[PDB]
Design a protein around this ligand. Structure first.
Ligand SMILES: *[C@@H]1O[C@H](CO)[C@@H](O)[C@H](O)[C@H]1NC(C)=O
Lengths: 254, 255, 250, 250, 254, 255, 253, 253
C-alpha cells in the first residue's frame, strides 16, 4: 500500500555529449508519483516519460550529459493526509580531427538547411547529430516567445550557427555565421525577443554572440550571410495540430 | 505554364458559429503557391492544408465563421524575376432553448474537466462542441508564453470558463466562474502573462474571461466554480519539446 | 445535515444616524458559516460578533445606518466537496436646534479633547455620541498607516473636526477647525499619508476638506488652531499583553 | 516641584529568551512623564504600562531579552517653559534535548494551528510559549498592512514557521515549512507586502527565508505544505465595539 | 485691554494703474496685530509698513490697483488663551495718445537702460513710471531664484521689455524686443528658471511671451536685440549689505 | 595711459577665522577695472567695495580667512579692441578654553534670539561674533529661494544652531539643536529647499546643520534646543522689495 | 550710398504648378549689406540661397519649388556704429491655371537604386517633373533627418522607388506603387527609430514620405507593386570626409 | 578573368607624422567587382574613398591622414550565382622618425570665422599643417554630430578659433588659446544638448574637441586668450537644399 521503489536508478559512467536514460519504477495503492531531482534542484534540461501500468509507475528521465551530477528518484503516495516516500539515487559521471561532414538528417532545421549541403558535426560530443539538434531547441527555449517577424530569421540564424556548412577542402572545418547576420537578427528582426533573453553552458553553445563572429566584408567567402527569408501570408492564428486532428475525428464519427 | 486556377472557392451562406472549408486548386510550371486573403488581410484564424501532385496544388482553408467576409485565393508562380498571378474570390455570408448539457468529449480540456460532469454547450453556435473547443485554443493563443506557475491556473480557468458545468436545475444554464477565481489567475498566478496580453476582438471577448462581469463566491458559494486545487509537478526547467523526443527515440531505435 | 437558517434577519425602519444590529442564526453538520452581504457587495462598515453553541452559529451584524440598504446572510457548510447554502435577506429603510453641547465621554479622543470643555453633538444623528465616535475611527481607517510624526497631528485634527467645541452663546453652534490647521497636517505632518489616501459619504463626514474651512486670519476667535512620546518602535499588541498577563497569573 | 524619580530601574541578569519588566516611578508638580531609552535610542520592541495616582507615575517597561542592553528612564515635567529632568539607568545582562512537544495554548495562532496537534517549543528560550507567541506578532509588525488575499496566507505561514509541528519519534524535532509554501506567499499572495518589507535578530527569527528551507519534492513527509471570509471592508475596532457595548448597558 | 480699531480703512475710488495706501490703526493691551485680507484671501501684491507707537499699532497697506477689491483690516490681541478681534473693511473701486517719452528716472533698471535714451511710458496707467517699475519687480518675482548666468540676461530682457525705447518720430510709440532676444533668454541663459516658472494679469503685463514679438530679420531696425552682457568675476557669495554694514559698525565700536 | 597698479595687495599671515581686507589700486586712461582672483578662480565668499576718482580706482576685497590662498588683483583697461592688463598677487597664510558666553549683538538673528540669553562664541575663530554672524548668512545663501513656510523654521534653526545657548554649567559649552528640530525643518517645513541644496564646502559644513549628528530631545529634554513656536503672518503673496518701497516713497514725497 | 540700398529688386512672377523659379536681389552699401529672404513673413521653408559678395555689392539668388502662391521679401541690411540701416523689396509669386510620361531615370540621388533598363513615371502635374521628383527625394531625406547606417540603404531604396515609380506594363503611363510590406519593413524595422522621431503634415511631406496604410499589398498581386529590393551593405569609413574637404584637398594638391 | 582579380595592388609607404596619403586598388571581373577597404581589421575610422567603375574595371582610391602605423587591405569581390569570389591585397603604412609658423588662413571650413588680417599658428608637428588642421575642424564637427541652428554658429567659432589659433604677438610662433569661459559658454549654453550626446577618447577627438578645464581664464589676462566672438545669426531656409541637388539643377539648366 505504501510507496516502494522496485527498479531504481542505475549509476552510469558516460562520455561528454552522451544522451543517457535513467529508470525508476514504483508501486503502491494509490499508485505513487515519481519526481526527479538533479543535484538538489529540479532537472535543468531533460525529458520525462511516464507510464502507469496498473499499480506500477514507470518513469524515464532522459538527459544530455555535459557535467557530472547526482540524480535522485522520489516515489510518493498519500494515505489520508500522510504522505509516504521512497528514495533512490544515481550518480552520472564523465569519463576520459575535430569533426565530420554529413548531410543534415534531423527535423528542427529541415526547412532552413539545404539538402545538397554538408554540415559540420562536432565530434567533441559522443552523439553529435542529436546533441546539435538539441542545441537548436535549447536556443529556442532561451529566445522564448517569438514574434512573426522574428521566427524566420531566428530559425535561420540558429540553424546556420549550430549546423554550419563545411568549408571546401579535405579537413573538416565549419563556415561560421557572419557578424552582420547575427546583428541583423539580434537588433532588427528579434530586437524585443533578444532584450527579454538578456534579462549557462547550454546558452553559450547554442545562442550566438555576435562579437565573436567575422565580418562579411573581411572576406565574403569565409562566413554565412542572412539568407533570403521567404515571406508567407499564413493565418495569424493557425489552429494547432491538436485542434485539427480533433476536428477530423469528429467528422469521422459522422 | 503561367498560374491558373482550376477549382475556385465557392461562396457560402452559413449560420453563426459554423465551420467551413474553402477550396482553391491551381496549376502551372512551376507549381504555383496559394495564398489566402481575408478582407484584404491575412486570415486571422484558420488552418491551411495543402497538397501538390503533378503540377497541381490543392489548398483547403478551414475557418470558424462568425462574421461575413470576402475570401480570395491568390495563385502565383514565378518565371525569371516576373511573377504570374491568378485570383479567385468567394463571399461567406451569415444567415438567420439557450443550450444543452453533455459530457466533455474533447482533448484540450481533458485533464481539467471531470469525466462525468455535464458541461453547457451554447447552441447559438451551429457547432457548439467544436466552437467551444476552438475557444480554449483561441484563449491560449492570446496568453502566448506562460510561466510554469501560470499554466495550471490558466488551463483550469479557461476550461471551466468555456465548458461551464450545467446547473442542477432542469433548464440548461451554465454555472459561471467566480470573480475570486478569475482575479486569482489574472492578478497572481498569471500576472505577467495577463499584462502582456492586455498591452496588445470578438474571439478574445468570448475566450478570455473578464473578472468584473463574474459573480462572487461569497454571494452564493453554490452558484459559481471556484479555484480548483493545482498540483505542482517539479518538471524539468527546460522540457525537451515533442519534436525532439520523437527524433531521439527514432534515432536510438535505428540502433 | 445541510445548512439551515433558524432566526432570519428582520427588516428595520430606523432614523438617520442610528446604530442597528441584524441577527442571523444557522445550524448544520458541520456548523455552517455566516457571511453578510450589503446591497450585493461586502459590508462597507460594520462589526460582526459571532458565537457557536450546540451546533448553532449566532452571527450579529452591527451597522451605522445613514442610507437604506438590502442586507443578506449566507449560511454555508460543506459535505465532502459540495457546499450547501441557505439565504435570507432584510431591508433597512430610513424614516422621517441643530445639536447640543456636552462634555466628551468617549475613548478615541480622550487625549486630544479636554476633560472640562463642551463639544458639539450634531442631533441630525439619532445616536450623536456614537456617530461622532465612529466618525473619528472612520477617518483613521482612511489614513491607514501613519508616521510617528503624523499620528499626534492626525489625532488632534480628527478629534477637533468631529468633536468641535461649542461657541459661547445660548444657541449651540460648533467651532470648526481653521484651514491652516487642516492644511498643516495635510501638507506637512501627514503629507505622505494624505497623498496615499487621496489615491464615500462616510469619507466626507469624517475627514476634513481644508478648502471648505474658515481662515484663522479672518477671525481667530471663530475656529480652532493647531495645539511626541518616544514610544517603543514595535509596541506590543494589547492581545499579547493580555496573553502575557493571563498566563503569569497562572 | 521638579521631577523626581522614586523607584529607579534595577539591573537584571537573565537568561536567553526571558521576559523582564523594568520599573520606574516618579513624582512632581505637574506629574512628570516617563520615557524609556534602550542603548541610546528608542525601545525597539516592548510594552509600556503606565499608571498615575496621587501625583506619582508608575511606568513599567516589559521586554523580551535576547541581547544585553542599557536601559534608562527619563522623568520630565515642565514649569512654565523650562523642563526639569531626572535620569536613572539599569543594565540587563545575559547569563549561562533541543525542545519539547505540546499543544498550542496561545491566541495569535488559534485559527491556523490545530487544537489536537503537537507543536515544537524551542527550549533555547527561557519562556518558549511566549517567545514564539511574540515572534508571530513580531512578523506581523514586519509585514505591516496586508491585503485581504495576503492575510490568510501570512497567518498560516507565520504560525506554521514559528509553531512548527513535531516529527513522529521520541526525540522532539520540529517539522519546518516547505520552500514552495514560503515562496508561494512571498511571490504571489503577499508579493506586494513582502516587497515593501524587503525595502534585526528579531526579523530573522520571526519571518521565514524561503532560500533556507527544504523542498516539498525532496521529501513531502519532512515539511509542511500550504493549507476567505468576506468580512466588512472596515471592521470596527474592538475599542469602539466595547465603547458601544458599555454604553448600551447604561 | 481688548482689541479695538481706531482709524479704519477708508473706501476709495481710483483710476486704473493708481497706487493707493490703506490705513488701519488699533489699540489694546497687549498691543494687537493687524492682518490685511484682499477679497477673502491674502493680498496678492502689495507692501505693509507697521509702527508700534506704545499701545497703538499703525498698519499701512500699499497697493497697485488694476481691479476692484474689498480690503479688510483684522486687529487681534490674545488674553490668556482667548483671542479678541475687531474688523473694518474698505472697497477699492475703479473709475472711468497712448503714452509719452521720457528718460528713465527709476532704480531697478539703472544699470541696463542708457541714460541718453528715451523710454515709453504707458499712460493707460495713472502712475506710469511707478507702475512699470513695479512690473519689472513683478517679473523678477515670477522668475524666482536666478542663476549667475541668467541674471544679466533676465535683467536686460525685462528692463528692455517694460521700459522700451521710443521710435524716431513725433508720435510716441515703443520699440519692442525681438523674438530672438526673448528666446535667447528663455531657452539658453534662463532655461531652468523659465521651466520652474512654467510650473495672472501682472504676469501677462510683465513677463514677455516670445511668440508675440517680431523677428529681428524682418527688419533689424524695428525691434531691440540681445545687448552686450558685460561679464564680471564678482565673488560667488557676495556678502549682503546687512553683513557689510554690521562689520563696519563693529569696527566703529573699536 | 595703459593700466598700472599703484598700491598692490600685501601678503597677510593671520590666525584661523580672521577677517582681512586686501587693497588694490590702479590707474589708466580709461580707468581700469579691478578683478579679484582666488586660487585661479573667482572669490568664493567676500565683499568688494570700489571707488573711482581722477583716473584712479581703489578696490578693497573683504574676506573671512579660514584656509591659505593666493589672491591676485587684475587691473585691465581697453584701447580699441586690444586689452591692457597688469597683475599683482598676495599670499594669505594661516598661523598657529573652548569659547565664551555673551549676549547676541548682531542683526541677522535679532528676531529669533532672546535679548537676554547667553550664546556660545567659538574662540577657535579669531573673530567669533563676526564669524558666526557670517555663518548664518552663509547658510541662508545655500538654501537660496525659500517658501513662506520655510523661512521662519530656517531662520530659527540656523540662528539657534550658529548662536547656541550656553549651558548653565560654569564652563562655557553650547546647547546643541535637537535631532527632531533639525529633521522637522529639513523634512517638513523646508523639504523642497533642502532637496535643491543637497543636489548641489567647509563653510557649508559649519553653517548648515546635519541632523544625524544631533542629540535627541527625548534622551534629555534639557540638553537640546527644540522647535520654537513660529507665528504665521499672512503677508502679501508678493511683498514689494525694499528697493521699490523706497522708490515709491520718495516719488510720492516729491509730490 | 553708405546705407544699404537695393540695386536689383526681386520681380513678381506668374508660374505653373511645380515650377522652379529663382528670385534675385542685389544690394550695395559700406560695409557691404547682408540679404535675408523672407517667405510670407517667416523663413523660407524650402529653398536654396546662392550669394556672392564683391566689395560693396552683394547679389543674392533664392531658388524655390513653387507649389503655392507666396509673397517673398528681400531685406538688405548693414550696420554703422550700433545702428542698423535696412532696405526692403518684395515680389509676389502667384500660380496660373495622360497623367505623366515614362522615361529613363537620369538624376543623381537615385542612380544607385534605379535600374538603367527601367522606365519610371514622371508626373506631368509638375511643370518640371524630373527636377521636382528629384527634389522630393531630398525633401523626404530631410524629414528623416539622422539616419543610421542600417536604415540608410533601406530608406534610400524606399523613397527612390516611391517617388520614381516604375511604369506599369501597357501603353498608358501609370506608376507601379511600392507594396505595403515594403513600406512597413522600412518603417517598422530598418528605420524604426528614424521613423518615430519624424512622426513627432506639410504638402511636401505628403508628396515625399510614403504612408504605408494607403499602399497595396504584395500578397494581393506580387506583379502589381514594387517589393523590397536586395539591399547592399557597404563597409564605408566610420568618418567619411565631407565633400567640401575632398575638394579643398584636391586644390592644394 | 571572370572572377575578381586585383590589377593594381596597394603599396606600402613610410611617411612622417601628419601626412596625407592615398592608397590605390584596381580590380577587374565580370560582373565588375566591389572594393572594400579594411583598416587593421575593422572599417577605416577616418578617410575618404573615391572610386570610379568603368565597365569591367573598378579603381578605388582611399585617402588617409596618417598619425599611427596601420595595415590596410583591399578586398575585391564579385558574385557569380550565389557564390562569392574574393581577392585580397594588403599594404602596410608605417611612420618615420620652433613648434610652428604663422600664416594667413586660406582654407574653406573657417573662412566665415577667421579674419583676413590675422595670422594663425600652423603646427609643424604635422607634415601638412594647413590640411591637417582643416581636417581637425571637420573631425570635431563629426564628433558633435547633429547641431541645432543656435549651436552651429557658436560651435563653428569655437572649433575654428581652437584649431586655427591666432599667433601671439612677438617673434616666436606661439598660439593664443581659447579662454575657458569661451569654451564653457559653448559647452554649457549654445551647444549644451549637443555636448552631452558626445560625452557618451580617440587621438583625433583629443586633437579636435577642446577640453575646457585645460584652458586659461579670460579673467586672468584678457589679452592672453581668445574670447567669445560676436556670433552672427542667419535667417536661412528651414530646409536648405543639399549641394548635390544645387549642382544637379545647374546641369539641367
Ligand atoms: C550574571 O551572572 C553570572 C553568574 O555566573 C556571572 O558570571 C555574570 O558575570 C553576571 N553578569 C552581571 C552581574 O552583569
Amino acid at each position: 500500500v505504501f510507496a516502494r521503489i522496485l527498479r531504481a536508478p542505475e549509476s552510469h559512467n558516460v562520455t561528454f555529449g552522451s544522451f543517457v536514460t535513467l529508470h525508476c519504477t514504483a508501486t503502491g495503492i494509490p499508485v505513487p508519483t515519481i519526481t526527479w531531482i538533479e543535484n538538489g534542484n529540479a532537472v535543468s534540461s531533460g525529458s520525462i516519460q511516464e507510464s502507469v501500468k496498473d499499480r506500477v509507475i514507470d518513469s524515464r528521465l532522459q538527459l544530455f550529459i555535459t557535467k557530472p551530477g547526482l540524480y535522485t528518484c522520489i516515489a510518493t503516495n498519500k494515505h489520508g493526509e500522510k504522505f509516504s516516500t521512497a528514495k533512490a539515487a544515481a550518480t552520472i559521471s564523465i569519463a576520459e580531427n575535430k569533426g565530420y561532414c554529413a548531410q543534415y538528417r534531423g527535423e528542427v532545421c529541415n526547412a532552413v538547411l539545404a539538402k545538397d549541403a554538408l554540415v559540420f558535426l562536432n565530434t567533441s560530443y559522443a552523439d553529435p547529430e542529436e546533441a546539435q539538434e538539441l542545441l537548436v531547441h535549447t536556443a529556442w527555449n532561451e529566445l522564448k516567445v517569438v514574434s512573426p517577424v522574428c521566427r524566420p530569421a531566428a530559425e535561420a540564424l540558429l540553424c546556420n550557427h549550430i549546423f554550419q556548412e563545411c568549408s571546401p577542402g579535405v579537413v573538416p572545418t565549419p563556415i561560421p555565421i557572419c557578424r552582420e547576420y547575427c546583428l541583423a537578427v539580434k537588433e532588427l528582426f528579434c530586437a524585443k525577443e533578444w532584450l527579454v533573453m538578456e534579462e549557462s553552458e547550454m546558452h553559450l553553445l547554442s545562442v550566438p554572440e555576435c562579437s565573436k563572429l567575422p565580418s562579411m566584408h573581411w572576406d565574403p567567402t569565409a562566413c554565412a550571410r542572412l539568407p533570403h527569408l521567404e515571406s508567407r501570408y499564413l493565418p495569424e492564428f493557425s489552429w494547432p495540430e491538436s485542434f485539427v486532428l480533433f476536428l477530423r475525428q469528429r467528422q469521422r464519427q459522422l
